[PDB]
Design a protein around this nucleic acid. Structure first.
Lengths: 53, 499
DNA sequence: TTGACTCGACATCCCCCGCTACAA
DNA sequence: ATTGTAGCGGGATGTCGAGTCA
């Protein structure tokens, strides 16, 4: 479960500006605690999510 | 006396988390870039960089009496390509900051604060870039892969993902400043592989940084060497993306010691990890298996069996295949009529040698009770394999797995009565220990339920708790009842507020 | 140069069904 | 008095950073 404004920044950092991953991921993981067990359990989900977007 | 540069298990566990998070993003970035490479608008402009003569070199006719000469022509093409790309690419930038090289945990933490300066790219600016020939070294290679692809060669994009090191336990982790940039760029993050149909191997091509083309056997020019170069480039996950949206972990090509040295640094070393990693790779692999996949796996297999025993004691901790005589656990013994599969020269004492066993020749033993907790008991007349010291003082006998056999608990009666222990429960430490005509129902209220219906049941002891005092206490996690009664119990449970 | 080894303070991984005593 | 309630794990093994030795 995640916003659509961050899902925007995240698709873009990941696709065209991964240099900037580091601070984005620092920010967002701090704003979405549950993301953590998500990412550990069901990465393939989080992946797929980044591909449509 | 104590400087002690170490962080909390909390921070450890976060770093592990962040390593995964950062990694997945990296590997997706590869996926997407590899798409953008296949851009058809781009392809059509890049084709015209490549003469017919060269084009022909990239697609030599099969030479049957000597395939080697076909590989040779293919190599000549790849070099003529490497040259004209040097020429296409006019302005080659320096990375702002670290590009996609590894960052230190501290650097990350601090990157929050200064949100710095980030242009935005998207897909057009990338395409436009590759066509003018303006960009950093990462872009340059990616274009090169575009060009080859537009010539209809099977040209992978390779990415050495450098997420932060989750084995770096250090609080302050500080780097040498001297020649920092010159040393970081010494080896590439991105490069290209190209498939030779004649020799059935993948050819390595780094047209922009090291500017060589290699057919890797045991050693590769691209794998970073020396303490300094590896602070920022720690080769762990080398990922190959192909035309058809394959995604394959090709680290074994580039890692000389994949199984001792490199494996300690991948998330892939514990079992959860491998399994997590495969999920990610599977998420990213949008094609179905080719025969090439098998020629490669065959390469990898051979690579993997020529690695052998490592040349040092530090490298045999937690090795997948191998273990020192000294690290065989107290609860392990050597499987009969086996012995060392090898020896290790111990650096820095003359003649001092260690015995190395294959992990496959070592047996794990468990005591009687220990087996029971795997739902297994001793086959009749079983000789013990070994004896140790337990704690007060007592000697606890251990047994091999084949000394033992499944416990088949008695079936329940017609009335659904379950056979109990001295304390009026049934012990279920493994699915096996659920009776055959019965099921286990786990729920804090299942006992309330069963008692209310007054159907016949028996509490499940599924484990023990340990606490202050030398005390142990059983965990009652549920109910064991006849299957016919399952539907009823589930209903009562669902309606527990109404009891 | 680099690995083996020691040493400092953490971690994991199995142990696998209790008892003394006070108080309203 | 009597009952409920509250107070009294750990030992082998393993892990990583550093400093010291050869």
């Amino acid at each position: 479960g995640l916003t659509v404004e961050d899902l925007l920044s995240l698709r873009q950092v990941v696709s065209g500006n991964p240099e900037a991953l580091a601070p984005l991921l620092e920010n967002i993981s701090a704003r979405y605690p549950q993301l953590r067990e998500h990412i550990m359990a069901n990465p393939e989900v989080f992946v797929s999510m980044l591909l449509e977007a | 006396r104590t400087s002690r540069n170490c962080s909390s298990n909390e921070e450890r566990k976060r770093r592990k988390y962040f390593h995964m998070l950062y990694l997945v993003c990296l590997m997706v970035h590869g996926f997407i870039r590899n798409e953008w490479i296949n851009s058809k608008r781009l392809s059509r402009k890049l084709s015209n960089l490549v003469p017919e003569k060269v084009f022909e070199l990239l697609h030599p006719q099969k030479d049957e009496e000597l395939p080697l000469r076909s590989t040779r022509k293919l190599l000549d093409g790849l070099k003529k390509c490497m040259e004209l790309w040097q020429k296409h690419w006019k302005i080659t930038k320096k990375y702002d900051n670290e590009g996609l090289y590894m960052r230190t945990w501290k650097e990350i933490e601090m990157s929050a604060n200064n949100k710095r300066k980030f242009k935005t790219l998207k897909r057009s600016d990338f395409l436009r870039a590759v066509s003018k020939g303006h960009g950093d070294p990462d872009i340059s290679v990616q274009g090169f892969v575009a060009m080859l692809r537009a010539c209809n060669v099977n040209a992978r994009l390779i990415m050495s993902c450098q997420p932060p090191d989750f084995t770096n336990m250090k609080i302050d982790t500080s780097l040498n400043g001297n020649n920092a940039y010159k040393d970081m760029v010494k080896y590439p993050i991105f490069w290209c592989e190209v498939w030779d149909k004649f020799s059935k191997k993948w050819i390595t091509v780094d047209p922009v940084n090291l500017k060589t083309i290699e057919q890797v056997r045991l050693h590769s020019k691209l794998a970073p060497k020396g303490v300094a170069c590896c602070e920022r480039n720690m080769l762990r996950y080398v990922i190959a993306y192909d035309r058809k949206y394959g995604c394959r972990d090709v680290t074994r090509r580039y890692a000389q010691w994949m199984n001792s040295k490199v494996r300690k640094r991948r998330i892939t070393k514990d079992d959860f990890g491998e399994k997590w990693f495969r999920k990610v790779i599977t998420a990213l692999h949008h094609r179905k298996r080719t025969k090439i996949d098998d020629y490669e796996d065959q390469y990898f297999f051979r690579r993997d069996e020529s690695e052998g025993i490592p040349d040092s004691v530090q490298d045999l901790k937690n090795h997948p295949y191998y273990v020192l005589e000294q690290d065989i656990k107290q609860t392990q013994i050597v499987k009969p009529g086996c012995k060392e599969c090898g020896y290790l020269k111990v650096h820095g004492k003359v003649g001092k040698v260690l015995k190395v066993y294959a992990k496959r020749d070592i047996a794990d033993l468990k005591s009687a009770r220990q087996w029971y907790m795997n739902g297994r008991i001793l086959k009749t007349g079983s000789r013990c394999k070994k004896v140790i010291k337990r704690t007060e003082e007592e000697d606890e006998r251990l047994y091999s797995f084949e000394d033992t056999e499944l416990y088949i608990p008695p079936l329940a009666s017609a009335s659904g009565e379950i056979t109990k222990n001295t304390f009026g429960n049934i012990e279920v430490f493994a699915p096996t220990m659920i009776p055959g005509n019965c099921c286990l129902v786990e729920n804090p209220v299942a006992i309330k339920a069963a008692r209310f219906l007054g159907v016949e049941f028996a509490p499940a002891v599924t484990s023990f708790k340990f606490e202050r005092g030398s005390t142990v206490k059983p965990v009652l996690s549920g109910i064991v009842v006849a299957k016919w009664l399952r539907e009823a119990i589930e209903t009562a449970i669902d309606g527990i507020e109404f009891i």
